[PDB]
Design an enzyme around this catalytic site. Structure first.
Site, PDB file in Angstrom:
ATOM      1  CD  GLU A   1      -3.217  -0.858   0.350  1.00 49.03           C
ATOM      2  OE1 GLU A   1      -3.364   0.286  -0.126  1.00 49.03           O
ATOM      3  OE2 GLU A   1      -4.044  -1.778   0.174  1.00 49.03           O
ATOM      4  CG  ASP A   2       0.509   3.850  -2.554  1.00 45.41           C
ATOM      5  OD1 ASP A   2       0.800   3.256  -3.614  1.00 45.41           O
ATOM      6  OD2 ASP A   2      -0.576   4.443  -2.381  1.00 45.41           O
ATOM      7  CB  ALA A   3       4.777   1.373   2.631  1.00 48.96           C
TER       8      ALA A   3
END
Ligand SMILES: C[C@H](CCC(=O)NCCC[N+](C)(C)C[C@H](O)CS(=O)(=O)O)[C@H]1CC[C@H]2[C@@H]3[C@H](O)C[C@@H]4C[C@H](O)CC[C@]4(C)[C@H]3C[C@H](O)[C@]12C
Ligand SMILES: [Mg+2]
Ligand SMILES: [Zn+2]
Ligand SMILES: [Zn+2]
Ligand SMILES: [Zn+2]
Lengths: 49, 389, 102, 92, 45, 49, 243, 50, 69, 49, 334
Positions: free
Chosen positions: B68-70
């Site tokens: 999730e975009d991390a």
RNA sequence: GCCACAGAGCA
């Protein structure tokens, strides 16, 4: 035509098959024709005359 | 989204950024111009004052910390200066002259019995204004202002106390006189911040993300030459968002670094992919930018070729050091006797109508009573049983 | 004098007869866990050798060794460490011989 | 001219008594922080920063089952994390 | 004790109790405090 | 722009539906002890289960 | 949630839990309340717990399940051409259990040339580690991409690309694990079956094991996206042009 | 007193070389177009009207 | 603002190649791709260290506060 | 036994705030409803909302 | 097999398969004599700052352990504390301290003792555990300067503060121990700072030894890495002009053309960086097969100048052996 | 400190 031509171990194809992220439409847009743009249910309105 | 986030990138501001005293200034220690430039970049002179660094990116799933975009950061890369920034803040005071012919004063340095300043005055200097270059912790004074009480007059102490989670250094002290003949004192503090968990990074194609983990260089994958990525990006951000321009940027940057020339990513044109593939082939690399990496944990070859190359990354102003907040018990409003608003007043978080309704949907009556009465504004009152008032 | 805090035997994960056991090692990471896994797995009596780092924030390593009935897990771990020492000695001797040769 | 804040103005709107101080209100013992992933945590577990955990406190009442633990927490003090910040006596 | 810098002419100067906040070599009215002489310690990290 | 309409609609729906509960005689009632449904959904089955 | 204490100045939650929150790690901030009463604490942990709220009340479907980068790793493990020797099998089993759980190794699927275990056996061990575990789940389900078999008389498990998943006892006999079997929004998933048959704790344990396995596996078995995955072939550019 | 906009024809920074900008402590790459009122630099935004 | 002492990715000392790089481009009139190879920068992570470096130290030093400008 | 056990545990538990659950289960899907223009069964001129 | 096969879309056979339980033969049991007979080391280059050597018939785990220990476990000396007196530079104090900590120092780590952290700062630093480096640079305008010059090295005197300005200050017995081997930076041309007239730098740096895991400035290697030996198998003869094309898919020294038979053959597979270009063309399908030898590692250890790369590799092997011995000697607590 | 104003963050 595009989807049946992609080989196995193709990352967008795998991610669409899993359902983890993306879909067949996104792969078809990236590799093949993007398609018609729909604005307010119609095509592009006449901005000019 | 990247038109929105380009205005939040930390970088150089102007050639006189160290002669300026602004209320908030984020500066980057080692800014770099991008490999994949644009004609608009050259025409607006963005390459003279860049905001971002070129990071070796491996687009792969390294751990669960890139979901999730991390993003996964390299600890050794951070230790060598990647993403290092400094934050500069300004505190201003005016020694205004009152109608009673009394004015504020600054001098004063309380020395102990031994001959050294007290802890609150450790970096305050003889003239009352803090010394340039010394560290200031929470609770210390860098401007020792005193206000006359009647406004031999008696002055009460109204000092400027530094209150922050991390220490800061006094970078500049400036005294002047305003147009109305009043003394004006500006103190510019600076603090050095390195990337940590929660620090927001952007990739100039949208793709905003915070750091999820900071791992060592030995735990990173590596290629034949020993190149170690600085940022690992999850592959799952590409299909649903369709950022092929990022892929072309990676290949163009790789071919440009190997050939020695900055590349162009101009809209409706720019550097073609075939030429960069030819450069990569002539340099002994793969035409698609996919390298073969050995895992740093097990040592074995990865069973898939890894998309490896330089990508321009921007460090955004949204850092976790200014976002973390915790209250417990603190100040309360004079009217409603409820906790205040905002982390600048040690305020509390709002349990609004929607959260109340969710707790109602759960059926937890005692939790709702504790949250909305015990923890906020409980009050013991006298009620008359006859008249009700 | 001995380091009692270095290696522990987790009782809640071990077996009654000592055939299966789990050891917690402090201040170690993959650079020893992988080598121990490779060396212990070469023991014919060991059927399950595997290490894990539960959290990168904690400098810790849990290694699980499950054997058959012929030997206990502690003996397997000691034999693996001894064989790792022998491997390092062989590599050291060959390397210094080749450096002195040229 | 800015209109005055009458009694009707203090009762209506999102910033009034009912929608700003009665239905929803500021609460104590709360913290706000940016989130980051952690797959090694159990799904019923959240990781709190050590700095936040030293501010957010839980009032434990001393019983016959937890006297030694709270004695150790009081000895540790407000700075060491397994510790305590305040003590309220029974008769105080 | 020389303690102040004129922001324009860059000359060391000091202020007494009755001295106005302005340079002496020129009429410039912005003064910057000079760096302290105390030891300041940093870690190289 | 859809978030404003969604939030207002959710606020209205919850202010209209918060008082209902399933009593111990399996009849859905309001806070004033008036029946909306004699049996929840005609069969008394939880959608969650 | 239950609190764990970590030193890195951010809140951290498992990625199987960010789907009910509609949260993603790109600058999101969340709030943490601490109930100050034993009654409130018990009500929160018993009615508002993550284990007791694995299903949304909108439709009863799971909402806390596998997310992205966990479905893909599970699919690559359960892919039909994934064969593991005993060393790799044992390493993967220690990877999902932090070197704590006891594993009973099943007999391999291939014995004569080498001893190789299929990743479906890895997931069978993930559902049921040893004989002391009480999780015995049986289900038949369809994947997201299901290509029917050659003949209509054949059953669904004889389909191409492992469309149909069959779990008998705790063994996985067919099919691949994807969003239809491990993810959210479907009532025929593995975690839903475990939660319905054997309670929420076993489902939580299985989800934690799957999260750890897919968080440590895809690093050592790489997965990347490149421009070669996006560029069309030579024959496509003519067919598209003529169409 | 009209508050003048920087790098206009009434400003001191008009058609000035980089050495003069260094003397006046102003960056040569500054776009200009703002008013310094009470120390704060403010920009009059362009307005759409019919 | 100044050339980094060490390459971020690997750790090679590239801070001592800046002056030689400038001399190679200015005096010998070599192209940028050959000057980097002549300095021993083979890996692309080291090449992007002084190929993308913007030397802002000279511009900042124009505004020195202890000496007239 | 399994079927009967599943049936008895599927009943609505007394005390449940079923109105709030229904209000949320109606309000929340309004957030994910993106724009689409629909037509009434092959007639491209009706445009029912 | 032991050949990691390389295909056009995937990498196959990457996991070691030498242990009992892989097959019914129950072979590949750990024998130290067989390992001693099979293991080989071949040195190809040994300079002062770079070593290249092949390890043959060793497992991947041990080679990776050696790499990780060289990167993050071999100690070296780097600047840790900086005390500042009158830093007037436009470079901030933190940045200058970081840059000074990032320079490599030519100090043998065996001559220094580890610093006890829990000790107070008054007695933490001794002459056995700290090296003091002094920097003192003042910039003055050059009076005898060219009239129209623009170079900062001619208008000013000390406009460039380099790494060679870090003079070594002996303390106590270091006046005798460091007599024949004075402390100098390994790269004296590191540009630490730039100055203009009126600016001054004066500082004292306390330098200790630590491991690379704590901070990247303590890593003694520029890069320590290995690559498996490439292997190109030409299954069928390739003749004529196609052979020339088959030569263009590889680096120039890899595959050559015989003068007699006019057929391509592999000349030096070591130079073959795996770009897998030959798998793009359909004409070379079922004619060439690419792989890497799984137990043939080519270590390339580049030192940072503190000490020789062969010493770094030897120290890594010794560290792994000492870790194993320490775990063997420890008691197991329940 | 009160009050508005302005910008910014997350779907
Ligand atoms: C650091 C270490 C002592 C530790 C206390 C000393 C003692 C033994 C020394 C090695 C041996 O001499 C063999 C060999 C000789 C060559 O000439 C240079 C390299 C070799 C590898 C040496 C390096 C180094 O000098 C060692 C390891
Ligand atoms: Mg978000
Ligand atoms: Zn009354
Ligand atoms: Zn002056
Ligand atoms: Zn490098």
């Amino acid at each position: 035509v595009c989807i049946n031509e992609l080989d196995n171990w193709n990352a967008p194809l795998i991610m669409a098959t899993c359902g983890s992220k993306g879909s067949t439409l996104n792969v078809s847009q990236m590799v093949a024709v993007v398609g018609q743009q729909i604005i307010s249910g119609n095509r592009v309105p006449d901005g000019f005359q | 989204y990247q038109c929105a986030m380009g205005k939040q990138a930390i970088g150089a501001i102007a050639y006189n950024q160290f002669k300026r005293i602004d209320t908030l200034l984020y500066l980057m220690t080692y800014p770099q111009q991008p490999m994949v430039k644009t004609k608009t970049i050259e025409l607006i002179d963005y390459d003279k004052l860049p905001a971002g660094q070129n990071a070796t990116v491996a687009v792969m799933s390294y751990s669960g910390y890139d979901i999730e975009d991390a993003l996964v950061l390299n600890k050794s890369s951070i230790d060598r200066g990647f993403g290092r920034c400094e934050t500069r803040r300004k505190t201003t005071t005016v020694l205004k002259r009152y109608a009673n012919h009394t004015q504020d004063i600054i001098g004063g340095m309380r020395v102990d019995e031994n001959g050294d300043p007290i802890w609150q005055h450790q970096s305050l200097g003889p003239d009352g204004l803090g010394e340039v270059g010394m560290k200031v912790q929470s609770g210390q004074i860098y401007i020792n202002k005193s206000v006359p009480t009647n406004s031999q007059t008696q002055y009460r102490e109204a000092p400027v106390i530094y209150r922050g989670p991390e220490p800061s250094h006094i970078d500049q002290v400036m005294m002047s006189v305003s147009d109305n003949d009043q003394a004006l004192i500006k103190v510019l503090l600076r603090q050095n911040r390195r990337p940590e968990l929660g620090d927001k990074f952007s990739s100039r194609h949208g793709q905003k993300g915070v750091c999820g983990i900071i791992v060592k260089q030995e735990d990173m994958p590596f290629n034949d030459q020993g190149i170690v990525p600085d940022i690992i990006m999850n592959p799952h951000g590409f299909p649903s968002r369709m950022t092929v321009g990022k892929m072309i940027e990676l290949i163009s940057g790789k071919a440009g670094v190997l050939n020695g020339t900055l590349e162009y990513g101009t809209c409706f044109g720019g550097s073609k992919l075939e030429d960069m593939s030819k450069i990569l082939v002539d340099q002994g690399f793969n035409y698609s930018g996919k390298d073969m990496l050995y895992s740093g944990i097990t040592g074995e070859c990865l069973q898939a070729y890894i998309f490896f190359g330089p990508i321009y990354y921007q460090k955004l102003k949204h850092m976790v050091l200014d976002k973390m907040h915790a209250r417990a018990r603190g100040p309360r409003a004079v009217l409603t006797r409820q906790p205040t608003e905002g982390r600048s007043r040690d305020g509390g978080l709002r349990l609004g109508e929607m959260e109340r309704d969710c707790v109602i949907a759960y059926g937890a009556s005692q939790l709702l009573l504790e949250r909305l009465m015990i923890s906020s504004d409980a009050f013991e009152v006298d009620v008359c049983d006859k008249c009700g008032l | 004098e001995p380091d009692r805090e270095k290696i522990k035997l987790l009782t809640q994960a071990t077996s009654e007869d000592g055939t299966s056991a789990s050891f917690q090692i402090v201040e170690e990471d993959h650079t020893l866990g992988n080598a121990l896994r490779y060396v212990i797995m070469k023991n014919p009596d060991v059927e399950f050798c595997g290490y894990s780092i539960p959290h990168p924030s904690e400098n810790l390593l849990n290694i699980r060794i499950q054997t058959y009935g012929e030997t206990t897990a502690v003996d397997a771990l000691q034999k693996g460490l001894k064989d790792l020492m022998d491997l390092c000695d062989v590599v050291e001797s060959k390397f210094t011989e080749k450096i002195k040769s040229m | 001219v800015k209109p005055i804040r009458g009694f009707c103005q203090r009762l209506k709107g999102k910033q009034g008594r009912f929608r700003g101080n009665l239905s929803g209100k500021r609460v104590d013992f709360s913290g706000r922080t940016v989130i980051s992933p952690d797959p090694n945590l159990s799904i019923d577990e959240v990781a709190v920063p050590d700095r936040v955990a030293k501010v957010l406190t839980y009032p434990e009442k001393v019983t016959r089952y937890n006297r030694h633990k709270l004695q150790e927490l009081i000895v540790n003090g407000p700075n060491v994390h397994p510790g305590a910040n305040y003590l309220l006596k029974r008769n105080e | 004790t020389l303690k102040y810098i004129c922001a324009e002419c860059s000359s060391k100067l000091s202020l007494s109790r009755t001295d106005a906040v302005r340079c002496k070599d020129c009429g410039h009215r912005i003064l910057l405090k000079a760096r302290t002489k105390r030891l300041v310690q940093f870690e190289a990290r | 722009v859809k978030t404003a309409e969604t939030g207002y609609m959710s606020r209205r729906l919850m202010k209209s539906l918060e008082d209902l509960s399933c009593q111990y005689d399996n009849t859905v009632r309001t806070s004033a002890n008036g029946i909306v449904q004699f049996t929840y959904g005609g069969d008394g089955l939880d959608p969650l289960e | 949630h239950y609190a764990k204490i970590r030193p890195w100045r951010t809140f951290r939650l498992n990625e199987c839990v960010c789907t009910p929150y509609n949260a993603d790690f790109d600058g999101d901030e969340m709030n943490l309340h601490v109930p100050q009463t034993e009654e409130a604490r018990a009500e929160a942990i018993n009615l508002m717990g993550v284990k007791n709220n694995l299903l949304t009340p909108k439709s009863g479907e799971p909402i806390i399940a596998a997310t992205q980068d966990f479905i893909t790793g599970s699919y690559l493990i359960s892919h039909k051409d994934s064969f593991y020797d005993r060393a790799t099998l044992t390493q993967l089993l220690s990877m999902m259990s932090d070197g704590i759980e006891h594993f009973d190794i099943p007999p391999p699927a291939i014995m004569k040339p080498y001893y190789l275990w299929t990743g479906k056996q890895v997931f069978s061990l993930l559902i049921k580690p040893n004989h002391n575990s009480p999780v015995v789940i049986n289900l038949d389900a369809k994947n997201k991409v299901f290509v029917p078999p050659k003949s209509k008389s054949l059953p669904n498990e004889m389909s191409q690309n492992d469309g149909f998943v069959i779990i008998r006892g705790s063994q996985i006999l067919s099919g691949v694990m994807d969003k239809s079997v491990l993810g959210d929004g479907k009532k025929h998933s593995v975690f839903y079956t475990i939660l319905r048959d054997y309670g929420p704790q076993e489902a939580a344990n299985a989800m934690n094991r799957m999260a750890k396995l897919c968080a440590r596996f895809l690093g050592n078995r790489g997965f990347s996206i490149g421009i070669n995955d996006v560029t069309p072939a030579d024959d496509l550019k003519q067919k598209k042009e003529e169409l | 007193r009209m508050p003048i906009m920087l790098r206009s024809n009434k400003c001191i920074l008009y058609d000035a070389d980089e050495s003069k900008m260094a003397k006046l402590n102003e960056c040569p790459l500054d776009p200009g177009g703002y008013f310094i009122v009470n120390g704060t630099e403010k920009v009059i935004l362009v307005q759409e009207q019919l | 603002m100044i050339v980094p002492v060490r390459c971020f990715s690997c750790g090679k000392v590239v801070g001592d190649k800046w002056e030689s790089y400038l001399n190679l481009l200015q005096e010998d009139e070599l192209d940028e791709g050959t000057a980097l190879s002549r300095l021993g920068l083979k890996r692309y992570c080291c090449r992007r260290m002084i190929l993308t470096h913007v030397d802002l130290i000279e511009k900042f030093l124009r505004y020195n506060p202890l000496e007239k400008r | 036994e399994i079927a009967l056990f599943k049936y008895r545990k599927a009943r609505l538990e007394p005390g449940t705030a079923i109105g709030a659950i229904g209000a949320q289960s109606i309000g929340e899907p309004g957030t994910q409803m993106t724009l689409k223009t629909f037509h009434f069964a092959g007639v491209a001129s009706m445009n029912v909302t | 097999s032991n050949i990691v096969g390389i295909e056009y879309n995937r990498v196959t056979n990457t996991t070691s398969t030498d242990f009992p339980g892989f097959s019914k033969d129950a072979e590949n049991e750990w024998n130290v004599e067989k390992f001693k007979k099979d293991f080989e080391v071949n040195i190809s280059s040994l300079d002062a700052r770079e070593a290249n050597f092949d390890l043959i018939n060793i497992d991947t785990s041990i080679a990776n352990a050696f790499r990780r220990i060289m990167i993050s476990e071999v100690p070296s000396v780097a600047a840790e504390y900086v005390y500042f007196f009158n830093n007037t530079s436009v470079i901030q104090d933190e940045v200058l301290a970081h840059r000074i900590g990032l320079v490599p120092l030519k100090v043998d780590p065996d001559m220094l003792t580890w610093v006890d952290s829990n000790l107070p700062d008054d007695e933490k630093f001794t002459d056995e555990n700290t090296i003091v480096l002094s920097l003192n640079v003042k910039c003055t305008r050059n009076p005898d300067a060219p009239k129209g010059s623009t170079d900062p090295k001619e208008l000013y005197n000390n406009a460039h503060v380099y790494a060679r300005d870090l003079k070594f200050e002996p303390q106590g017995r270091q006046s005798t121990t460091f007599a024949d081997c004075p402390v100098v930076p390994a790269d004296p041309d590191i540009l630490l700072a730039k100055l203009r007239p009126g600016q001054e730098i004066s500082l004292k740096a306390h330098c200790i030894l630590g491991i690379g895991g704590d901070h990247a400035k303590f890593s003694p290697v520029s890069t320590a890495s290995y690559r498996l030996l490439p292997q190109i198998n030409i299954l069928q003869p390739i003749k004529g002009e196609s052979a020339r094309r088959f030569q263009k898919c590889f680096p120039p020294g890899v595959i050559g053309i015989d003068e007699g038979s006019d057929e391509a053959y592999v000349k030096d597979a070591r130079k073959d960086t795996v770009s897998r270009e030959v798998l793009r063309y359909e004409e070379f399908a079922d004619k060439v097969k690419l792989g890497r030898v799984r137990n043939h590692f080519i270590f390339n250890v580049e030192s940072a100048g503190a000490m020789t790369p062969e010493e770094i590799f030897f120290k890594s092997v010794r560290i792994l052996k000492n870790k194993a011995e320490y775990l063997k000697n420890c008691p197991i607590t329940q």
